[PDB]
Design a protein around this ligand. Sequence first.
Ligand SMILES: [Cl-]
Ligand SMILES: [Cl-]
Ligand SMILES: [Cl-]
Ligand SMILES: [Mg+2]
Ligand SMILES: [Mg+2]
Ligand SMILES: [Mg+2]
Ligand SMILES: [Mg+2]
Ligand SMILES: [Mg+2]
Ligand SMILES: [Mg+2]
Ligand SMILES: [Mg+2]
Ligand SMILES: [Mg+2]
Ligand SMILES: [Mg+2]
Ligand SMILES: [Mg+2]
Ligand SMILES: [Mg+2]
Ligand SMILES: [Mg+2]
Ligand SMILES: [Mg+2]
Ligand SMILES: [Mg+2]
Ligand SMILES: [Mg+2]
Ligand SMILES: [Mg+2]
Ligand SMILES: [Mg+2]
Ligand SMILES: [Mg+2]
Ligand SMILES: [Mg+2]
Ligand SMILES: [Mg+2]
Ligand SMILES: [Mg+2]
Ligand SMILES: [Mg+2]
Ligand SMILES: [Mg+2]
Ligand SMILES: [Mg+2]
Ligand SMILES: [Mg+2]
Ligand SMILES: [Mg+2]
Ligand SMILES: [Mg+2]
Ligand SMILES: [Mg+2]
Ligand SMILES: [Mg+2]
Ligand SMILES: [Mg+2]
Ligand SMILES: [Mg+2]
Ligand SMILES: [Mg+2]
Ligand SMILES: [Mg+2]
Ligand SMILES: [Mg+2]
Ligand SMILES: [Mg+2]
Ligand SMILES: [Mg+2]
Ligand SMILES: [Mg+2]
Ligand SMILES: [Mg+2]
Ligand SMILES: [Mg+2]
Ligand SMILES: [Mg+2]
Ligand SMILES: [Mg+2]
Ligand SMILES: [Mg+2]
Ligand SMILES: [Mg+2]
Ligand SMILES: [Mg+2]
Ligand SMILES: [Mg+2]
Ligand SMILES: [Mg+2]
Ligand SMILES: [Mg+2]
Ligand code: NA
Ligand code: NA
Ligand code: NA
Ligand code: NA
Ligand code: NA
Ligand code: NA
Ligand code: NA
Ligand code: NA
Ligand code: NA
Ligand code: NA
Ligand code: NA
Ligand code: NA
Ligand code: NA
Ligand code: NA
Ligand code: NA
Ligand code: NA
Ligand code: NA
Ligand code: NA
Ligand code: NA
Ligand code: NA
Lengths: 73, 237, 56
Amino acid sequence: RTGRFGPRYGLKIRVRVADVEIKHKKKHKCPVCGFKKLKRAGTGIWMCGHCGYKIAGGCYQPETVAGKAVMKA
Amino acid sequence: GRRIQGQRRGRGTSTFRAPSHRYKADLEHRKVEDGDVIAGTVVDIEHDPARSAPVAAVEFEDGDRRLILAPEGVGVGDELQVGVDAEIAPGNTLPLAEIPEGVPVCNVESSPGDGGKFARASGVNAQLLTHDRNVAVVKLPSGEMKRLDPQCRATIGVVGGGGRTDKPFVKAGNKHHKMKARGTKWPNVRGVAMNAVDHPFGGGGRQHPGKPKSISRNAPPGRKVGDIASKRTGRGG
Amino acid sequence: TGAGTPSQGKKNTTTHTKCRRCGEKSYHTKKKVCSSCGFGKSAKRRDYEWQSKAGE
RNA sequence: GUGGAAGUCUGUUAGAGUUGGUGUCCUACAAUACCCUCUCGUGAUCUAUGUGUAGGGGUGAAAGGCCCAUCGAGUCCGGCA
RNA sequence: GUCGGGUGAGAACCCCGACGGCCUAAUGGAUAAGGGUUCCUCAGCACUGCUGAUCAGCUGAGGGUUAGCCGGUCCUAAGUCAUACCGCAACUCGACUAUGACGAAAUGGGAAACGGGUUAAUAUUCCCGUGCCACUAUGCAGUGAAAGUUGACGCCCUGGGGUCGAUCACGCUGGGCAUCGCCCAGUCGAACCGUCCAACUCCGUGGAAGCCGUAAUGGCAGGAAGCGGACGAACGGCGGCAUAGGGAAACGUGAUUCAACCUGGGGCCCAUGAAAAGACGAGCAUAGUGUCCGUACCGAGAACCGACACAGGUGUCCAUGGCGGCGAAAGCCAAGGCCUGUCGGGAGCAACCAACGUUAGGGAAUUCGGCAAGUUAGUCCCGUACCUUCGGAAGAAGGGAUGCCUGCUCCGGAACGGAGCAGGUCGCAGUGACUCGGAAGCUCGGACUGUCUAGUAACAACAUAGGUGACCGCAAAUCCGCAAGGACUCGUACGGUCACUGAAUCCUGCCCAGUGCAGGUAUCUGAACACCUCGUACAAGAGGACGAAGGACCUGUCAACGGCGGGGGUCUUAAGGUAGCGUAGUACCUUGCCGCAUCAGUAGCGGCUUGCAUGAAUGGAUUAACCAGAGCUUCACUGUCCCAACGUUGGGCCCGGUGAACUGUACAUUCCAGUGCGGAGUCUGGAGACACCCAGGGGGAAGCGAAGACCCUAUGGAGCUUUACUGCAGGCUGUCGCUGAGGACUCUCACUCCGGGAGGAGGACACCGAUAGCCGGGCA
RNA sequence: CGAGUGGCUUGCUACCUCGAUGUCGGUUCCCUCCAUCCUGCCCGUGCAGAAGCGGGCAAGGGUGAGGUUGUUCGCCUAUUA
RNA sequence: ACGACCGUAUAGUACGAGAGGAACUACGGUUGGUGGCCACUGGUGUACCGGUUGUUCGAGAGAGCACGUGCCGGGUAGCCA
Ligand SMILES: [Cl-]
Ligand SMILES: [Cl-]
Ligand SMILES: [Cl-]
Ligand SMILES: [Mg+2]
Ligand SMILES: [Mg+2]
Ligand SMILES: [Mg+2]
Ligand SMILES: [Mg+2]
Ligand SMILES: [Mg+2]
Ligand SMILES: [Mg+2]
Ligand SMILES: [Mg+2]
Ligand SMILES: [Mg+2]
Ligand SMILES: [Mg+2]
Ligand SMILES: [Mg+2]
Ligand SMILES: [Mg+2]
Ligand SMILES: [Mg+2]
Ligand SMILES: [Mg+2]
Ligand SMILES: [Mg+2]
Ligand SMILES: [Mg+2]
Ligand SMILES: [Mg+2]
Ligand SMILES: [Mg+2]
Ligand SMILES: [Mg+2]
Ligand SMILES: [Mg+2]
Ligand SMILES: [Mg+2]
Ligand SMILES: [Mg+2]
Ligand SMILES: [Mg+2]
Ligand SMILES: [Mg+2]
Ligand SMILES: [Mg+2]
Ligand SMILES: [Mg+2]
Ligand SMILES: [Mg+2]
Ligand SMILES: [Mg+2]
Ligand SMILES: [Mg+2]
Ligand SMILES: [Mg+2]
Ligand SMILES: [Mg+2]
Ligand SMILES: [Mg+2]
Ligand SMILES: [Mg+2]
Ligand SMILES: [Mg+2]
Ligand SMILES: [Mg+2]
Ligand SMILES: [Mg+2]
Ligand SMILES: [Mg+2]
Ligand SMILES: [Mg+2]
Ligand SMILES: [Mg+2]
Ligand SMILES: [Mg+2]
Ligand SMILES: [Mg+2]
Ligand SMILES: [Mg+2]
Ligand SMILES: [Mg+2]
Ligand SMILES: [Mg+2]
Ligand SMILES: [Mg+2]
Ligand SMILES: [Mg+2]
Ligand SMILES: [Mg+2]
Ligand SMILES: [Mg+2]
Ligand code: NA
Ligand code: NA
Ligand code: NA
Ligand code: NA
Ligand code: NA
Ligand code: NA
Ligand code: NA
Ligand code: NA
Ligand code: NA
Ligand code: NA
Ligand code: NA
Ligand code: NA
Ligand code: NA
Ligand code: NA
Ligand code: NA
Ligand code: NA
Ligand code: NA
Ligand code: NA
Ligand code: NA
Ligand code: NA
């Protein structure tokens, strides 16, 4: 997490980096299979190490509040 | 005095240009004779150095291989379709007319065939509200209600990479690297930090602007700095 | 660093060379233009009225 | 315990920089040098070569700094006795 | 450097030997740029060489550079040019679009060479031997042949494969030493051809419901382990090459750690890490062809840039030589190089100076200030406060240990790897030299790393993430161009432009009167064309009607410029200072008052505080961490001081050689007084005064150096500013031309934009040309 | 209230120097003046003594060390004839 | 080329109600200044001797280098306070 920042940057900066990245690094449940093997490949790119499915998602999360609204509509 | 920095920009020298040669593709919708038959498959997902957002590589039936402004939720294997009779799923492109109202769209054309102009940045999206035989009313991310020829094509879904703006750069170092991939001079020195000769706000024994910051729309380049034709400033009221 | 003596040391770049056209050592090999005769810029030879007193 | 993150630490590794000595020098070794001391040293890093921007114009993390020992408007010749 | 010797007319510095030293990422080896013959040989010393010279990078004359397989050449990169097109009065000018070409010699890509020998000087170029590549021809094979692969790629961590090197063991060959038995060198052998294959991927078998596996992550009924197989690596192993070569000889075998090279796994990005030629895909024999350019030497404390044989500057590779140790560190020493950071001889060698060592007792009394110097130090064990953003503070502080010798234990496969034990034992001192933090506390500032005044400023200044406001839907906002055109932009509001503020935390009050910006506007004001009236046979010209932007007027807006008082229990001019903070880096009075601290404190810190003249993004308060930033206190330390001394090295002094510059109206041995344009070696009066020379420290020559920067003067200059004067771009707006049909409207045909086209949007507007009004330090 | 001396302060003047007479404070080293702070010799006393106060001659010698401040000045401390 | 102070005896005396408290003179010492000297104490003493770390000469012995002594201990003459 944010610990690599030492006593630099301040509270809000690094609290939001740990938060974004903790969610960022969470086991994600893949769209194709149902397995929780989705990891970020880069900015907005996600893949599942299990079947290798490579997806377009949020920048720090595979799904964004807006991406879900689409499914419905 | 000397030309201010905003005038230096205009000259288009190395320092202000965009590292174009390092860019991948000019994301634009495909041209289709008609019929809509055109479909293709998602061969891969890449990073767009020009938009800090993901982009999809696609292989069309007629052999054509082109990168595509990738909406959220497109993966490798998926089949996208472009045409009047395109199915109505995320990733597919078709004129606003064939699109059902109430649906989120991105990479909208300003005039049919231009290849898409509106809503293309990370996680944004337009909102198709009203239909008609003559006008298609779309709500662009800025919130403006834009009237468009129902023939302007567009992509279903919201642009991928959403939420990029949520996390702070944290350190100069990170801005640095981002900036180097854009047509932008960075960092930024404050006008009031410069010398009278370099900027209308420069000079003085302390740092403050000479006159008020709101400048007239009619101000000539060289003078037009600060708050441009501001309709109001501050937060009060 | 001194812009003087200490900055003279990096000067091992070749620029002005023997010109094919006028024979002067003024052909800027990086610009491919002669500063003396204009070769590489003008078909006509470089010449100016200010190269001499106004009435001469 | 493992892992090995960092505009992270120590560091005359290489390299970069230049705080104090207001030392030595000051018809110098040198039109910006010598020594000790000191700062950085995985990064907004340092560096070679190639390449772009030209004078009321460039370039400037801004000191009116820099653009060949030349800068609050380069240099050369001319206007010019 | 020194002693001998060689050559020579001549020898400190040219050469040989010995002895003594210097250089270890360089003072060695190979090179890029740049130089340009500086390279080698012979002959010389008038020039050059910090002295000399028989020497030389000097002078003169000769000689020297050999390539199918090393570079160029070829490809394409940022980008550049040429032609066409268009612009411009015009071009040697100018943007776009086409096409073509150029653009990489260490250091991008890339068909192919190794070993030995040879010259005064070349060498993967010559010679000897061996090997390899491309093209073409002939012949056999082959119909395949273009899909694909490769070329071809970021940063961090890491496993395995593995050569050289280094080391260890043992054997052989040669050498050294001479109380031992030790110590050193060597023990060789290529390209290439052939062969072997770990890793990754995949196939079959198998059938795990908890096992498999890693340094770590991890894997699996969507099929784990195990077993069998396909593909598949090294500049590596192995065989050939090789009764080649090389060595005086022997002409080794194993091992460990393993640069190169090969091959995997993981992690990071608001950063995504070239292209093209070419190669492979796609056999073999024989033969022919492989031209053109570079090739010497230096590569630096003398061959480069810096006027110089300049203590400066200048890129790459050798980062694996030994001991040491964490180490590419110190220190010492190999190989290699050097005694050319090129003037010497003499004096116990004084004064004085530069670098430096040691100083009793005291211990910052020195000083603006602890400036300078010193103290501390490596490693292990114990132990560690306030504060804090919970990361940190922290190596806090403080305490202890530390060698050698003998014999052992533990971890590991092992190391010539690490951790420990017991006993013995020497010194004042065991990180014994070297290497190697002094520590603690208060306050100010900026949050942090970073930037800057090349050459007196490194800071508190800039930047920064973070906060905030403004503009714009893309035929945009902003910006460049005279134009043709262009940056932003392979971009599209989670954007990018224009500004302010400057991390976190708590917060950010009141004011729209002035100024700015923006919106509205009945009425008022408001130019030109057209129109109407008067005038003129026309025309000048006077007047009227209409009225755009703009202004008056009204509104919005301060995280827009900025403001936040006097008086009384409202007045100027809108409000009348809120939270905080406060004698401030802001406080005139001022050394404010009180306290802490000291013998004594214009300092410092805390409290008070009526604040000459604090205060909220002109941001306020506060704040952990950080800092060659500013002030202060304590412990420790010490030649900073009391108060100086002795010593070390290089100068200084004498001698040989070389050999400048600054400065000079004249005269000049001056001193005390006086006088003078009031600051005299020179006048006047006195006094003193034999001439010359050496060394000194600098009192005077208002010493030398610079036509004073300060100040004033000049109808001098320049940069900068603005509601100074006058103008100019540019923006807005009306009108006319392009421009067409039927104070509001439709259409389509010019013209514009979108579309590959069909066609779609727009449309007499817009764009452009002309003109008129407003704004107009952006510019002159 | 009146008369003076000095040339340390301050002011005034604009004579001298603008082809430059290097600033304040400090330091170090040298000479001097007396309007004498101490020391020697004296006079008066509201001089018992002791300790003082005031005055005369007199420049031989001495007149030191520290805390704040760049300070001069001054404020403060402990020594001192 | 000497300036000045303190102390003892004078003396608890003269003087004085008392408290308190002199002098002349003779002595001892201190301080500042001055000139000289080194038996004594102290400093130096890269003369010298010893201890010892790293490395090199194979070990030993004996040596070089570690800035002009590697460091530590002792230190004669001389020069000094
Ligand atoms: Cl950004
Ligand atoms: Cl070459
Ligand atoms: Cl692995
Ligand atoms: Mg594009
Ligand atoms: Mg932001
Ligand atoms: Mg970060
Ligand atoms: Mg850029
Ligand atoms: Mg800034
Ligand atoms: Mg400034
Ligand atoms: Mg200006
Ligand atoms: Mg400010
Ligand atoms: Mg310059
Ligand atoms: Mg660091
Ligand atoms: Mg460091
Ligand atoms: Mg460059
Ligand atoms: Mg300035
Ligand atoms: Mg020049
Ligand atoms: Mg030679
Ligand atoms: Mg000769
Ligand atoms: Mg080429
Ligand atoms: Mg190459
Ligand atoms: Mg040679
Ligand atoms: Mg050669
Ligand atoms: Mg030399
Ligand atoms: Mg001492
Ligand atoms: Mg003091
Ligand atoms: Mg003092
Ligand atoms: Mg210091
Ligand atoms: Mg074991
Ligand atoms: Mg030590
Ligand atoms: Mg202060
Ligand atoms: Mg800072
Ligand atoms: Mg400077
Ligand atoms: Mg600094
Ligand atoms: Mg500096
Ligand atoms: Mg700042
Ligand atoms: Mg900001
Ligand atoms: Mg911002
Ligand atoms: Mg406010
Ligand atoms: Mg105070
Ligand atoms: Mg401000
Ligand atoms: Mg003058
Ligand atoms: Mg002036
Ligand atoms: Mg002027
Ligand atoms: Mg177009
Ligand atoms: Mg002006
Ligand atoms: Mg003078
Ligand atoms: Mg008298
Ligand atoms: Mg006297
Ligand atoms: Mg020695
Ligand atoms: Na200003
Ligand atoms: Na852990
Ligand atoms: Na320095
Ligand atoms: Na100019
Ligand atoms: Na002239
Ligand atoms: Na092989
Ligand atoms: Na080693
Ligand atoms: Na010599
Ligand atoms: Na740093
Ligand atoms: Na107002
Ligand atoms: Na207003
Ligand atoms: Na204020
Ligand atoms: Na810094
Ligand atoms: Na000393
Ligand atoms: Na003198
Ligand atoms: Na100026
Ligand atoms: Na003068
Ligand atoms: Na002075
Ligand atoms: Na006296
Ligand atoms: Na004082």
